[PDB]
């Protein structure tokens, strides 16, 4: 249909809380090939966040069950086959997103803010795939995650102010990637510390978009508190 109808359909699906519709709509808006405005970008991001978060949350519950069972092998095999089905639904969702990123969003993005956003998004979606990868495949999924956050990180150092929510959000996600996926808590802490400190200094760089920057800085410092004790 028309790129407008599609967007309108999405905001309906979103109102209905039908997030798989919403992601189908926004996927096809993106496949039309034109650079996505902020409103479209955001609608895309919302839809897939809900669609994947459900699977992730489902995966966390079932995997922790398959692990906390040590009685009957029958129950444990049932739980494994279910964790497997879910992982499958999950690889699929990420792989769609990762390809929408490669084919359309990253190469069409004309402004650094938006480049940074979609690189971050690529880092997040490889992160997800990594939590669920095997011993063989995994060293390499992790690396694709790191390369993307790294690239996002460098553009945002060169091109955005240290208080921009998208820059801070990247720092927050990249630091959690260091702590939790790569086990480098030294790297995690300094990245988060640095980011907090740079935002603190150029504090006059704030604006109507501050409550958000300071909430994000609060979350970065919270991680520091938690990770050092």
């Amino acid at each position: 249909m028309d790129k407008n109808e599609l967007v309108q359909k999405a905001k309906l699906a979103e109102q209905a809380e039908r997030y798989d519709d919403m992601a189908a709509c926004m996927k096809s808006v993106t496949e039309q090939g034109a650079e996505l405005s902020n409103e479209e970008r955001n609608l895309l991001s919302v839809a897939y966040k809900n669609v994947v978060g459900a699977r992730r949350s489902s995966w966390r519950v079932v995997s922790s069950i398959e692990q906390k069972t040590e009685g009957a092998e029958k129950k444990q095999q049932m739980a494994r086959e279910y964790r497997e089905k879910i992982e499958t639904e999950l690889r699929d969702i990420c792989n769609d997103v990762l390809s929408l990123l490669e084919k359309f969003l990253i190469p069409n993005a004309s402004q650094a803010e938006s480049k940074v956003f979609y690189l971050k998004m690529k880092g997040d979606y490889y992160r997800y795939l990594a939590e669920v990868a095997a011993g063989d495949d995994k060293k390499g999924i992790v690396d694709q995650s790191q390369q993307a956050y790294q690239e996002a990180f460098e553009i945002s150092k060169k091109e955005m102010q240290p208080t921009h929510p998208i820059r801070l959000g990247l720092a927050l996600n990249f630091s959690v990637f260091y702590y939790e996926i790569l086990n480098s808590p030294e790297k995690a802490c300094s990245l988060a510390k640095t980011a907090f400190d740079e935002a603190i200094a150029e504090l006059d760089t704030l604006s109507e978009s501050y409550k958000d920057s300071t909430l994000i800085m609060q979350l970065l410092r919270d991680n520091l508190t938690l990770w050092t004790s």
Partner: peptide, 11 residues
């Protein structure tokens, strides 16, 4: 939960 949610922050 609008601008922060979109931003898909780490858990």
């Amino acid at each position: 939960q609008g601008x922060x949610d979109x931003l898909d922050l780490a858990x």
